[PDB]
Amino acid sequence: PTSDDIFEREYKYGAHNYHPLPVALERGKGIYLWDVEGRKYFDFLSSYSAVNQGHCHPKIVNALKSQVDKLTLTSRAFYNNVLGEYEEYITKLFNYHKVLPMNTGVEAGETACKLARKWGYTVKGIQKYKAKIVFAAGNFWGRTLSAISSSTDPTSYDGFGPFMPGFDIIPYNDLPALERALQDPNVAAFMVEPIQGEAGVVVPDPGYLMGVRELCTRHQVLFIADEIQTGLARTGRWLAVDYENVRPDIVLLGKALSGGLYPVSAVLCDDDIMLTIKPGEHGSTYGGNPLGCRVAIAALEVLEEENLAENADKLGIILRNELMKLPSDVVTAVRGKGLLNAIVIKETKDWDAWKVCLRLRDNGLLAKPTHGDIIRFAPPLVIKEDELRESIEIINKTILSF
Amino acid sequence: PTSDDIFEREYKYGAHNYHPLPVALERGKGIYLWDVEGRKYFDFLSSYSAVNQGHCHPKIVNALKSQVDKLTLTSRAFYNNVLGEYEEYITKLFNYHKVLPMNTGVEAGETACKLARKWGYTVKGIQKYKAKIVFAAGNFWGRTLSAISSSTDPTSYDGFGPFMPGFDIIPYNDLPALERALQDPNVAAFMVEPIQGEAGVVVPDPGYLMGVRELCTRHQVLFIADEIQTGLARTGRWLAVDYENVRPDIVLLGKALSGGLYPVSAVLCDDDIMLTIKPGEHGSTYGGNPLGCRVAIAALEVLEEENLAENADKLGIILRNELMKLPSDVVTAVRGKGLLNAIVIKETKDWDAWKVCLRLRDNGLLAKPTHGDIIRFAPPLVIKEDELRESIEIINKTILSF
Ligand SMILES: *Cc1ncc(COP(=O)(O)O)c(C*)c1O
Ligand SMILES: *Cc1ncc(COP(=O)(O)O)c(C*)c1O
């Protein structure tokens, strides 16, 4: 049971929709991952912030093992005793009226889009099927037909049939462009990420979120914040928009909502926006199952009273201050918030970001390159200062070996 | 901790996107479900065939508990040792070249649509973004924007913005309509359910699947079979199309693929169709995680060598033969295949399907009405003959009380 057998066998019996890093992880706990040959690695991807609480956090595992013996799925055609308990906990946590439970991040964005359109027709008064939704250039909220229709990345939409109408694209971190776009009364909502992660951790200028809220409120437009990756204590707060005291109309949550043990996502908004969807007009089979709700309550509790937001904030400050000491001729820029950071590599034909992640894997650290010149660093929020500094020493050892 | 508290609290802190049956289930094992007050019920919905192996089947629970202690999610940016093992098992089981793992049923249909479009452009030679996909009237493959765009049910698409172009709708169980529709060379695929479940378990005439295959092959069109609900031993075979020896180009699986313990879905097709999606052109965060793959292997093994397909076939024969003994003036029709069946109620202002399911719940049986006059019966495939006959006696006792 070796690694290259795993590589070739997945290549033979699995779809070629991914080009992952050559490493076959078998075990994982906290901030560490072990492959099949026993080698230990620092996890600096966190499954795209899906295991912020670390791999197999014990409290989440205990909640999953406790609920699997009782009940797993009844479908939303009946009631169960756990779904509402998770609903009240997350609604009082983020201080919104209601929450709509889905499974994956795509479904949370699809739910937000249908909520915005239904709201624009029944509340805003838009002529039916003429409403439009604005997206920031370089956004990523999944890979459905609707999701790739609002993407500016050719690798996501090229060759996938016609595209979703009613999707407008404005540049990211651009108040004048949003102000020009919101002049159309048919615009129902503007969906944006507080920090564009999949584009290379692109942090907007300070005051951008406050301006987006002011523009959406002034022009009667729903502010949709995709916090599926940025939210849940990674950037340093419960939501990344909390850094500017901004309350979006609709908030999206995912990934870290379960600590990597279950596909759980949530859509939070107030009554006048949520109640636009009548009974039987939206839902999902696994959406809101008791098992996923138990592990979501456990993940949110171990996010709150294990102190991981300020932990990620201070360790991210240390991480960025340490990365900026590398010379400016090999590291073009260092950006990020909390434990969600990235660096830019002066890519040439001598090296690129992929070869760095290969050599980082050889030295015991797993990272993800997003464009051949950008490398992301996002360790689980349970990491400590000594472990972080040892990881950065692996980063410096790898970079200074070229 | 009573039931009406659960009802009102979900109504206060949860979205009103469902109108479920008033019963708060807390426990579940095999074919039985217990509510919070301790009352026992027969499960005749099976979470829309998601728990075909029964609630909390022990082998699936053991596989979940074994894998949760080792590894849960690494993201497809790296390899893991379990994903490929599940891929080889399911590909050799259904005898296809490759499988693409997603989480929910919507994602499996979205993957099939993008595969068909990419295939139509790179293989069939359709001018880019001019391809079309045909759907049968009354279909249901989820509730995303693309899914509701091909639906003829107003409760699914009304008020949800503009709609997906390139979606054509033909009547279900109609060979001439499919033959007329496939005359357009821009048609890339035809997605259909072998048995339309969400529409009221509409069974097509014998030979319909053979004619669909003959028409799709003759006109160079991809046959997509949505077996997410009909597949996995419920209708009596691994796939419902196996009743007519039909091999679709693309097969969709979901729900019962995990026994209700995890959102796992699969898209099975050959190489010349699957390899059209290059690395980095599709995927999902939780798609193909090790935990979901372990519970999928367990669910498929307890579906195979626990003998549930022929079990559902014979018990479905007994179920239909027993239901057809009710008088024709209260039960209009009785249709179905395997343990997926439904009856038609001569609805008046004296009664409807909802009041029947309420009285059935009062007598210890949980069923789901789909149109106010159609009632579905789908118990888990682990049910036995004596338990089935006791359940039908509850059905007759309830019907004959009006
Ligand atoms: C903002 C945002 N939304 C969705 C996703 C992808 O989630 P799934 O893979 O569909 O569960 C990402 C990661 C994201 O950043
Ligand atoms: C054929 C088919 N496809 C999808 C679904 C819904 O699945 P999810 O709720 O998205 O997991 C159904 C049930 C179906 O019959």
Which among B335, B334, B316 has a CA at the least distance from the CA of B325? Answer: B334
> Are B94 and B238 within 8 A, CB to CB?
yes
Please check whether residue B36 is in contact with residue B45, taking contact to mean a CB–CB distance below 8 angstroms. no
- Match 């026993």 to its residue by tokens: A38
CB B72 within 8 A of CB B290: yes
For every residue of A249-302, DSSP letters joined together read SEEEE-STTTTTSS--EEEEE-HHHHTTS-TTSS--SSTT-HHHHHHHHHHHHH
Answer yes or no: A78 catalytic. Answer: no
Task: Give dist(CA A192, CA B277) in Å, integer.
Answer: 27
User: Rounded to the nearest whole angstrom, what is the distance from the C-alpha of residue B252 to the centroid of ligand 2?
Assistant: 10
**Count of beta carbons in the 10 Å neighbourhood of residue A171:** 12
Please answer whether residues A159 and B118 qualify as being in contact, where contact means their C-beta atoms are separated by less than 8 angstroms. Answer: yes
Say if residue B214 is exposed, middle or buried (CB neighbours under 10 Å; 0-12, 13-18, 19+).
middle
Report how far residue B111's alpha carbon sits from residue B102's, in angstroms, rounded to the nearest whole number: 8
Q: Does the C-beta of A7 come closer than 6 Å to ligand 1?
A: no
The Cα B82–Cα B289 span in angstroms is 8
Structure tokens at B216: 């799709």
Side by side, the strands of the sheet bearing B265-269 are B98-102, B265-269, B250-253, B222-226, B187-192, B132-136, B167-170
Instruction: Annotate A320-329 with b (16+ C-beta within 10 A) or e (fewer).
Output: bebbeeeeee
User: Which residue type, as a one-letter code, is found at position A391?
Assistant: S
Q: Can you say whether residue A27 is alpha, beta or left, with left for phi > 0 and alpha for psi between -120 and 50 degrees? A: beta
CA angle B162, A175, A340 (to 5 degrees): 90
Q: Which residues in chain B have their CB less than 8 angstroms from residue A163's CB? A: 129, 165
H-assigned helices in A103-174:
105-122, 145-149, 154-157
Q: Distance (Å, rounded) from C-alpha B281 to C-alpha A153?
A: 10
Give the C-alpha separation, B149 to B168, whole Å.
10
Q: What is the biggest distance separating any 2 CA atoms in chain A, rounded to whole angstroms?
A: 62
Spatial distance between the Cα atoms of B222 and B213, rounded to a whole number of angstroms = 9
Give Dmax over CA atoms of chain B in angstroms.
Answer: 62
Residue A106 Cα to ligand 1 middle (Å): 6
CA-to-CA dists, residue A326 to A273, A317, A385, A389, angstroms: 48, 16, 19, 14
What is the rounded CA–CA span in Å between residue B135 and residue B167? 7
Which of B42, B160, B251, B370 is best to mutate for the A interface (most A CBs within 10 A)? B160
Instruction: Tell which residue, B219, B220, B274, B224, has the closest CA to residue B246.
Output: B224
Q: Which candidate, B383, B347, B311, B342, places its Cα nearest to that of B197?
A: B342
Q: What DSSP string runs through A204-242? A: PPTTHHHHHHHHHHHTT-EEEEE-TTTTTTTSSSSSGGG
Joined tokens for residue B20: 């479920």
- Cα angle A54, A55, A58 (rounded to 5 degrees) comes to 85
DSSP codes, B202-252: BPPPTTHHHHHHHHHHHTT-EEEEE-TTTTTTTSSSSSGGGGGT---SEEE
| DSSP label at residue B55 | B
Nearest listed ligand to the Cα of residue A104 = 1
Contact A144 B110 (CB under 8 A): yes
CA nearest neighbour of B151 among B164, B138, B162: B138
Residue A226 known to be catalytic = yes
Q: Which residues is B355 bridged to in the sheet?
A: none
What span, in angstroms and rounded, lies between the C-alpha atoms of A254 and A257?
A: 5
Q: Is A255 a catalytic residue?
A: yes
DSSP state of A243: G
Side-chain-side CA neighbours of residue A399 (13 Å): 23
A336 min Cα distance to partner chain B (Å): 21
Q: Tokens for A149?
A: 């229709």
Rounded to the nearest 5 percent, the helix, strand and coil shares of chain A are: 35, 20, 45
| Catalytic pick among A118, A132, A255, A368 | A255
Exposed e or buried b per residue across B227-248, where buried means at least 16 C-beta atoms within 10 angstroms of its C-beta: bbbbbbbbbbbbbbbbbbebeb
Residue of B266, B153, B254 lying closest to B200 (CA atoms): B153
Experimental method: X-ray
**What's the length of chain A?**
402
Locate A24 and state its tokens.
Answer: 């076959």
Q: Pairing between strand B132-136 and B98-102? A: unpaired
Q: What is the resolution of this structure in A?
A: 2.7
Spatial distance between the Cα atoms of B371 and B333, rounded to a whole number of angstroms = 14
Residue carrying the six token digits 């795993």: A6
Q: Which two tokens stand for residue B331?
A: 């039960």
